[PDB]
Design a binder for these strands. Structure first.
Length: 58
DNA sequence: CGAACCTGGTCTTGACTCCATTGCCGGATTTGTATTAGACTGGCAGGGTTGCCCCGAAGCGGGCG
């Protein structure tokens, strides 16, 4: 079905596999963080420039 | 009988030639680095074949605390 932790346990146990091919390992690694939009990019760029000026001032 | 001679070299002096050998210098080519603002967001991809043997690891029946 879609619940009762059978499919959930299957997805969890299939997440903790070997994946001996290094390309598949790196792709499963990078398919983790959430993608962003233009507002998130604006926010992160402003935070980056603020942090850079703050550490240069320090 | 002596005497010129003539010619092996042995060697030097002086002028001449000629080509390496750096040295700038001006320009040519060669090589390296930086920068491009619309938006773009998790692979293609190729095969699976023997026989025999040894041995080491995974997993399952079976009793035990």
């Amino acid at each position: 079905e879609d619940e009762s932790e059978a499919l959930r346990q299957a997805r969890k146990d299939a997440e903790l596999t070997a994946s001996a091919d290094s390309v598949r390992a790196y792709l499963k690694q990078i398919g983790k963080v959430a993608l962003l939009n233009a507002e998130e990019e604006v926010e992160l760029a402003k935070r980056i420039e603020a942090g850079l000026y703050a550490t240069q001032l320090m």
